[PDB]
Every structure is written in structure tokens, then in C-alpha cells.
Design a binder for this molecule. Structure first.
Ligand SMILES: [Mg+2]
Length: 176
């Protein structure tokens, strides 16, 4: 369908673009075109309008936090995360196209395993226990907030899993 093609091309990585402007800028463009927001290290304010992303020096701004609320990010789109070195915080909220495979993809990026401190996954209806468990590879995670994930059916097992694999994790669960 047209709409499927459109979502795919919103997500698809342009590796020329990564070469030209660097991973953080290329990922910022992906996220904002897909309805997400980013915040750079050293800045208080968020980037929320694509057209206002900075044009100041090449590869200077580094993503610290991502807030993808009501966003069409999915699957291959997350390949834009591969070159990012400093991402500490990700919120995925009402990301209706995200699935376990998206979380798996993220969890396998060693760059994210090194940097990630906080993750929030809220009202992403496809996510299941499988996708959540994959997040144990984020070995430095300090905060994980899960909310309104009806596909997550065994929350007590999730708690016990993380209690072993990430004993210092603050795990906040608002799950039925
Ligand atoms: Mg949004």
C-alpha cells in the first residue's frame, strides 16, 4: 500500500546522509520527521520542529535524550541509532508501530548498551514480555518505566528477571 511505503521511506536510513552530516544529525532528522523529539547534550530545550534543527558546526550536537510520543518510528528506522555514542534516555510513548523486534534491534547496539541510563515504554500496544526482556543488555540502565503494555503478560517474571540481571535497576511498573 501507499501508506506502508510512506512509513517505510520515513524510516529508511540514507547512509549518504549519515556520511554528510554525521549520525546524530541524521538520526535527529529521522526522529523529527517521524514525529519524535530529541534533546542534545548541553541543551535544556528540545528539538521538536524539523525545520529548526541547528545548522551550526558539523557533527557538534549529540543526542542525549529521545522522546518519541505519537511517532511512526519502526524497525529499520532504528538503524539510525547505530552511530550514536551518547544516548542516555529514550521514551517510547504511543508508538503504535513498535514491536518486540524493534526493542531487540536496539538492545543489540553496543553503543546503546554502553550509554543508556533510562528507558520508558508507555502505551506501545504490540510490546510483549519478549521485547522487554531484551532490554537486559542495557547493562548500565538505572531506570525503566513500563506503562499500559497489554502484551506484557507476566510482569512478576519481568521483575524477578531484572532483579537478577540488573540489580540496581529502578523498575517502575504501571502494568495490568
Ligand atoms: Mg511526537
Amino acid at each position: 500500500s501507499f501508506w506502508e511505503w510512506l512509513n517505510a521511506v520515513f524510516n529508511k536510513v540514507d547512509h549518504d546522509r549519515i556520511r554528510d552530516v554525521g549520525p546524530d544529525r541524521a538520526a535527529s532528522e529521522w526522529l523529527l520527521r517521524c514525529g519524535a523529539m530529541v534533546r542534545y547534550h548541553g541543551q535544556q530545550r528540545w528539538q521538536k520542529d524539523y525545520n529548526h534543527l541547528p545548522t551550526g558546526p558539523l557533527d557538534k550536537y549529540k543526542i542525549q535524550a529521545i522522546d518519541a510520543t505519537d511517532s511512526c518510528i519502526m524497525s529499520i528506522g532504528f538503524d539510525h541509532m547505530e552511530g550514536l555514542q551518547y544516548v542516555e534516555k529514550i521514551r517510547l510513548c504511543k508508538c503504535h508501530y513498535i514491536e518486540d523486534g524493534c526493542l531487540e534491534r536496539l538492545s543489540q547496539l553496543e553503543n546503546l548498551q554502553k550509554s543508556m541510563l533510562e528507558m520508558e515504554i508507555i502505551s506501545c500496544g504490540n510490546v510483549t514480555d519478549k521485547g522487554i526482556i531484551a532490554l537486559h543488555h542495557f547493562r548500565n540502565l538505572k531506570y525503566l518505566f513500563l506503562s499500559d503494555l497489554p502484551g506484557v503478560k507476566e510482569k512478576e517474571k519481568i521483575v524477578q528477571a531484572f532483579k537478577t540481571s540488573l540489580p540496581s535497576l529502578e523498575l517502575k511498573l504501571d502494568l495490568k
